[PDB]
A paper describes a structure:
TRPML1 regulates lysosomal calcium signaling, lipid trafficking, and autophagy-related processes. Loss-of-function TRPML1 mutants cause a neurodegenerative disorder, Mucolipidosis type IV (MLIV). TRPML1 forms a classic tetramer: each subunit contains six transmembrane helices (S1–S6), two pore helices (PH1 and PH2) and a ~30 kD lumenal/extracellular domain. The extensions of S1–S3 (labeled as IS1–IS3), including several basic amino acids, present an unique feature that presumably binds to PtdIns(3,5)P2 in the membrane.
The cryo-EM structure of PtdIns(3,5)P2 bound TRPML1 is detected in a closed conformation at 3.5 Å resolution. An electron density is observed in the cavity created by extensions of S1, S2, and S3. Our previously reported ML-SA1 bound structure in the absence of PtdIns(3,5)P2 lacked an extra density in this area at a similar resolution, leading us to putatively identify this density as PtdIns(3,5)P212. K55, R61, and K65 in S1, and R318 and R322 in S2 are involved in PtdIns(3,5)P2 binding. In addition to the residues in S1 and S2, the side chain density of Y355 in the PtdIns(3,5)P2-bound structure is adjacent to the density of the phosphate group of PtdIns(3,5)P2, implying a strong binding between these two groups. This interaction enriches the negative change of the aromatic ring plane of Y355, which recruits the head of R403 in S4 forming a π-cation bond. PtdIns(3,5)P2 induces Y355 in S3 to form a π-cation interaction with R403 in S4 through the binding of its 3′ phosphate group to the hydroxyl group of Y355. This π-cation interaction affects the movement of the S4–S5 linker, a common allosteric site among TRP channels. Compared with ML-SA1, which directly forces the pore open, this stimulation is indirect and mild, explaining the low proportion of TRPML1 channels that are active with PtdIns(3,5)P2. Single channel recordings of mouse TRPML1 activity indicated that the open probability of TRPML1 remained quite low when the PtdIns(3,5)P2 was bound, with less than half of the channel population presented in an open conformation.
Numbering used by the authors:
A (entry chain D), B (entry chain A), C (entry chain B), D (entry chain C): 38 to 201, 216 to 526
Amino acid sequence: EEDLRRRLKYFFMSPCDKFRAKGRKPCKLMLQVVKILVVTVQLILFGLSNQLAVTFREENTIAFRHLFLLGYSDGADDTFAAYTREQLYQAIFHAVDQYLALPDVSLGRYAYVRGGGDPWTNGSGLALCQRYYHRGHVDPANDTFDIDPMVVTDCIQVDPPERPSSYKNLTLKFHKLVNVTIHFRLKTINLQSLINNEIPDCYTFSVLITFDNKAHSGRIPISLETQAHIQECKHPSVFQHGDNSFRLLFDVVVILTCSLSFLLCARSLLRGFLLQNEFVGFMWRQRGRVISLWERLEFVNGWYILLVTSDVLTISGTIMKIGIEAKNLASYDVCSILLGTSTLLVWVGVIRYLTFFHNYNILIATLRVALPSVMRFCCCVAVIYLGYCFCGWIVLGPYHVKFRSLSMVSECLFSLINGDDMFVTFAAMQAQQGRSSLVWLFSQLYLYSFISLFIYMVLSLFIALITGAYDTIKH
Amino acid sequence: EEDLRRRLKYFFMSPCDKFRAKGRKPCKLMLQVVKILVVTVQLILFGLSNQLAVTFREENTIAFRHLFLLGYSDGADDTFAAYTREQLYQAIFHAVDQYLALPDVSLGRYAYVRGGGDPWTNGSGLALCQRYYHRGHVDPANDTFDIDPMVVTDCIQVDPPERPSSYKNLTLKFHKLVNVTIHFRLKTINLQSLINNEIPDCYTFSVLITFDNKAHSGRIPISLETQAHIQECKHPSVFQHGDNSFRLLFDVVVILTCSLSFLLCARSLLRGFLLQNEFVGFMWRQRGRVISLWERLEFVNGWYILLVTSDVLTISGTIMKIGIEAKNLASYDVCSILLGTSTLLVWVGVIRYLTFFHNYNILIATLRVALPSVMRFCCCVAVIYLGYCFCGWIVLGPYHVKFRSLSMVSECLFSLINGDDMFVTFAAMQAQQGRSSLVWLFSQLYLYSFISLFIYMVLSLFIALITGAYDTIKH
Amino acid sequence: EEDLRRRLKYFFMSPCDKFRAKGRKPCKLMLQVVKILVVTVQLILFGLSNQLAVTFREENTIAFRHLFLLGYSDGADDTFAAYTREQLYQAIFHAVDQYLALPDVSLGRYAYVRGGGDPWTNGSGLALCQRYYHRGHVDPANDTFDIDPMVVTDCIQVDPPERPSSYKNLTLKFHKLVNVTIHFRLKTINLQSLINNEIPDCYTFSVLITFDNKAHSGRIPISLETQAHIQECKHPSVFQHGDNSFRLLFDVVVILTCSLSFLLCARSLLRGFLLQNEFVGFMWRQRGRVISLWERLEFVNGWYILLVTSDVLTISGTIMKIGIEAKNLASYDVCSILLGTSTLLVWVGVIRYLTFFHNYNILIATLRVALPSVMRFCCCVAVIYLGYCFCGWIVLGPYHVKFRSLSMVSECLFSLINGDDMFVTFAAMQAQQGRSSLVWLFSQLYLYSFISLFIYMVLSLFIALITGAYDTIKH
Amino acid sequence: EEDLRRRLKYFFMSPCDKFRAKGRKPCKLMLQVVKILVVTVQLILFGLSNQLAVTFREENTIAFRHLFLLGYSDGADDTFAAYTREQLYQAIFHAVDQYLALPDVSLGRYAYVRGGGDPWTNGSGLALCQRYYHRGHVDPANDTFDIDPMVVTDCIQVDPPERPSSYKNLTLKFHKLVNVTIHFRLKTINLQSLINNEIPDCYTFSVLITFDNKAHSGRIPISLETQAHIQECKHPSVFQHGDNSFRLLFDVVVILTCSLSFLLCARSLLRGFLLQNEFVGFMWRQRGRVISLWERLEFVNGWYILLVTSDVLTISGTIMKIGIEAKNLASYDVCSILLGTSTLLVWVGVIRYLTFFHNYNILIATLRVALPSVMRFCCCVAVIYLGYCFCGWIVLGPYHVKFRSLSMVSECLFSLINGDDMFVTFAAMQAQQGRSSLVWLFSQLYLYSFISLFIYMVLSLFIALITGAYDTIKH
Ligand SMILES: CCCCCCC[C@@H](O)OC[C@H](COP(=O)(O)O[C@@H]1[C@H](O)[C@H](OP(=O)(O)O)[C@@H](O)[C@H](OP(=O)(O)O)[C@H]1O)O[C@H](O)CCCCCCC
Ligand SMILES: CCCCCCC[C@@H](O)OC[C@H](COP(=O)(O)O[C@@H]1[C@H](O)[C@H](OP(=O)(O)O)[C@@H](O)[C@H](OP(=O)(O)O)[C@H]1O)O[C@H](O)CCCCCCC
Ligand SMILES: CCCCCCC[C@@H](O)OC[C@H](COP(=O)(O)O[C@@H]1[C@H](O)[C@H](OP(=O)(O)O)[C@@H](O)[C@H](OP(=O)(O)O)[C@H]1O)O[C@H](O)CCCCCCC
């Protein structure tokens, strides 16, 4: 280690001491602080323009359910059904009649589509379409029954009248019926153009009223769906982008700064890998076998690859965010996960700046020496944790509601060891103290042996390992 | 210990070192890993075929309550009652009339039983049957009252009409009335034969509408019950078991592998007990009294007896699971507990493989040296815990709802020390700050002295014992 | 300490070694174990006979509210009111009319009182009585208003008809009205005489329908109350006490055993105080000042005074429990607290028997050396805890519901540091983000600075003191 | 340090030893104990007079909603809306008609205002006023739309009749409509003058029924507001202040004692700063550089500046509390925060008296040596905590309700790591397992990685730092 002392210790420096190392004037770190401001402001003024459009989306549907569903009070979304045969007729007819009488009874001023799509013939806007099997004769007590999947879409066409038909003539064939759907579309004008100060968006909803009968169980649920397909509406007017282009040319700063930091930080990655070739031979091997691909690991800094990671996502995110002016994408999920996961991972990079101080390094490196020991034991618990998830899903599965699928059992058990919704699950078992009294006595032994296992002997390790690691770092 | 060194140290080995011990090629452990795949897949494809039949069971009843109970909205299962005398007449008659008019008003296409059982004469399908005392004259203010239990079942017979009677003529004798029941049966065809791709099941429900009056309290609850008695329905058709026997001959692999592992693991149990006779005398006793029936305990390995235990349950479980093709059992509880408790106890056997590594052994043996000290102290707490359960059941028993039986008090207190449903129980006491103000002041002193006892001086031991044991294992 | 070695070490012995001390055959401890069986069985068969009578009490009232209150659905107990002036007339008249027509419309077979009490003239059973001021002329915009408390009870008398009056002629004088009450009584026969196998109880309810108007706020609540005054009903019949006196002469065993143990244990108290006079002078004082009234404290054993305490309560409790055959007391609170607090304090005496073993003594004496240090710090927290209770009661008092009285704030805060009903109280503040936006910003700073104080710096002491005490006891 | 030994050690004394220092008779500390009684009694008898007026305020509104809102049942405050066009007409007309018929149908005896304010012409009491745009022609499918904010207030005037008009003639112009408001006022007399024993307050409510349509979404919410403007009512009567001035001249004791303590405690502040000039030079500097502005910090006692702080707030608070007799302020927030924050901060001053004992000093100074290390690490967590708040607000923002604004996300996450409302947020995500199945899989990974981070590796530090600090203070 004679002549490589100066260059291999420059790589192990800190910008508190780089200032007095060779006089570097470290703006190569200060640009990373600009991301903390610019990406978050890119994020916050993306969220507020998106939130205000969601409340317009999720409140016209609440308007539509009080106009298109017969007897719908509030709250009962998923428990709204039709049980008789004439409850199903009055539900269908009331949904059509309000559509034919929309500008007289409803406020809000919608207007019809006069569409040209696939489940509509030309002129037609509303179409109620049955679905039933091709040929099928099911009959209990004479069990000569034929089932062949071949569904026929019998649509009934109706267009809205222009100025102030035979759909009432309708049979349904219930013993073969699959589902009855209703399709229509409605344009409108958003009228929140005042706090935007300029020309607003212009919507087109797409309603699907669904009379679904899959289970053939004598109970038909009733649903409603919308998709706000947004595009701009026709105008020859001007003066809109006096301030609007001051948002349209802000993401170009995000395009600049994250890319210019993607250039800068990777050059250090280019520097660190380049300086590996010299330490390998290094005296025409003297020690030789001491380099072992884990002593190679402390060359590439883990903070930089995290800063490279966000900048891949961030400039991929904001280039997708450009698709709000004229691009026909409604991909409000892919553009949203990329921006949030960047900001979730940009802000954790601040902890690096806290480790430059001699006090805060103790608490963070306490996590670093203990993150192995927790992640070892977290595998020891997850094996037992998957044991109770498969056992509780079969025994307590048929009789209850919370324990029906694995994605609920892994939630109803995991929310239970922290101490939440515990008495409610004990109270739901005691509708079975008469009905099948073995399953009750298993459920008392299942639940008590689980909640008194993870708090009293598993949670205590996670307190003991960190205490056991905090003694090592300071002595 | 001269000549027994090699054989008594082979028994204390590990399959990480058995490979270099004598060249054994340890497939005698790899067969145990096959259970992890086969039993779980035996479990998961048992659950999904069982779940889909439960949702058909628990949704035809929800259909039946909206057809057979007068004025039943959703949610109010247990608080649905009839209070006047004419609420009870209109509830009975509406339950019969919908039965006589089922194919005209209900969708789902049920059909009648035309039964031959015990609470039905021949031809009859529906039977409403009173229950009242033989002779009894209760009268307040003239208390010459006779009570002798001798109940008479007065049934009224009615059969459904074939093509498009005197039950309206009915008296009830309320001062002697016990309960009025209604029995009928309905066959149907499940029509979820598409994702099964073959001939579906064919059900027969059994409805019991119960007008129960036990307490004679001027309030009659109303109930409904079903039991889906399933059997196959008549067909001369074929092509069903092109893929269905590929489930019917999968459990035979579970029959093979768990049994072949029941043969293998017990041979080591046969080996361990056989090698006990030599260590007893062992030098025509030299030490003699040192063997003390607890130094005998570390011979039989505790992991093997757990692997024997599941294989008893597993091949007993899956042989009961064969009763789904043609066996008339509906025993969906006994066959379910055995399979789940096996899988709960098969998956914990994976922890043995984690103890072969030098890191994971530390965390597990920390539990093993601390499982005595916790189970000592768990007896010290349960004595005090049963103290508050008997004290709170008498004082707070009459005035409240959660504290009515011991099986609720042992739930309402145990869910309370973890911190769940705590404010709701404090809020329920304050309907008694005027009504009997001593019981209120006891309830503030009962609850505060209990929740501030188990968190602050009992939960702290369970954190202290594990920390106190983690120092011993690593130093 | 020459000649007092043998007698002063006999007093420091254990019954594990008293057997080999002088051959005592320790039945003077085994009688204390008899209490564990006898008092608990005295308790459990007191609770089950009491529980079954409460469900008859609290279900006839639920019957009465569905017969006597106009438009009462379930659940809405405390939010049932009458707002107009004709809602109050229809509520009163419907309550009288159902009383006049009770045997025709209600099941359950009640019967009238034909009473002779104070708010009833002779023959009369029902009495609706106004309450209003003597003389008062309140008038806004002409504020010459007189208020003098002198209330007049104007009752209207009505008796039930015998075989198949002017109360409809009624004015109420609302501007002076205080409350309108309705009183009647109803006898009945309990008919759960079958599982008792003998002659049942015979009740007399006392209904009070209350139209309370205290606040004069334009909103009158409506209430209902009962008191089941129980006594036996008339009979010349016999054969009741073939098994019933086998309960009536079981408490005499509780009278025996607790008293015979009250005699035995106090003789040791008589022995311990008697042996104090000798240690005082003890060598015509040698050390003298070393006895300091805290070294006197370890003479009288703390376990015995607890066993004396329960036996005072237990034989006082069960002698009050004798008042269920013929004594006219309804004191079901005083007799219940004494029995439960005994059993709560009898069962903690079992821990003494656990301290005879060398293992369990460590965990219990860990509590004993740490019970000072916790109770010191519990005073340090309660000072700060009363600080937030007075601060939160004034600021957040007017705007919310949970924070209205101190008895709720001491519950809503104490249930909050354990982690229960936390988000619901944060959600209730955000109806004030527009209404008085200073109180909102205080409420975010009030709640966050409190819940993040007691979990993160106060709960951690209670874990640290016990860990800090567990190291002292074992080293 | 020769001659300044006596004076610089008098400043480091305790009143347990000041009694034997120079014979001081320490009433200069006992006056501070008088505040504990006087301020709290000033607080409690302020709260009870304020609480009783709030329940009169918040129960006349509950009366008003059952009289002025068409079809308002209880509970549904924020979900009460009008969806058709004729639901809006029947809601307006029913609100006017009940106002015109108030003394005939309502109890409580209100009376009209006959007002003279700004949204009322002379004589008029009720005024329903539209709001709509000046000129605007919005039309979908012909998008020549004009929007200019210029709102016109078209009021309709109506006065109540004196002894036993054209507002029914009304159009609304819905396509331009903004909001319809209704204003009126009602005086009354509180009649809770009995427990006050003297002349009560005399109120004037101000009702605002709001038909708000901002979003133009086809859904109009309906609201109600009151402001109880209180002043005294006209009387020539006397005898009121026989006991009432015994409250009016109690706050003057609070004016005395807190001010006389503000004089006393600040003289010690005047003493401590005065004695700093001597320690600076102190030997014409010998050490010189050892004084470093943090060794200056232990001169001014931190307990006194807290006692100065409350006395600033307390005498500012109670001088604002004088504004309840005749001052027209309704500022019941500013006068309330000052009194509560004083009492919150007066009561923490009691801990100083606990530190005079040798036992309680250990627990408090354990907090003092650990309050740095917690507040260091609390910055390390809040950086990561703001990361998840920005990430969860965009991804889970559109699809759910709890995650809509940052002020809820900082509550829904912070209430979640303590273990409250955890399963309810997992259950709300599973309405999206079909709808946009990427956002579901992110939500399982978002929530699990957060709740299993702060309990298992962040909560454990807060237990480890206090344990790590409790070892330092006692060894
Ligand atoms: C000049 C010829 C003789 C050299 C003899 C002395 C060698 C000595 O002067 O050092 C090498 C020097 C420093 O530049 P390096 O990048 O090689 O080394 C580190 C830098 O201090 C920072 O990077 P930079 O500011 O350059 O972007 C950064 O703080 C670190 O990484 P990090 O903290 O993780 O970000 C490292 O990367 O390189 C060249 O001579 C630069 C030449 C000047 C720039 C020319 C163009 C304007
Ligand atoms: C006999 C004359 C010479 C005495 C010389 C030896 C003295 C030595 O033999 O000891 C004193 C002896 C023991 O009786 P004591 O009661 O004085 O001393 C303890 C007893 O062992 C237990 O009480 P006991 O069984 O009596 O109810 C009890 O275990 C302890 O208290 P505790 O564990 O807290 O419950 C102590 O109280 O007293 C008398 O001589 C008893 C005489 C025999 C009974 C006569 C009537 C049947
Ligand atoms: C007298 C001339 C020769 C002096 C030589 C001895 C000097 C020695 O006697 O000491 C100085 C003495 C004590 O008074 P000081 O205030 O200077 O010093 C402390 C006092 O013991 C308390 O304050 P006090 O009771 O006065 O309000 C208080 O306990 C402390 O502060 P704290 O505990 O934080 O509250 C300190 O402030 O001052 C003057 O001589 C007082 C003169 C008598 C009062 C005259 C008017 C009635």
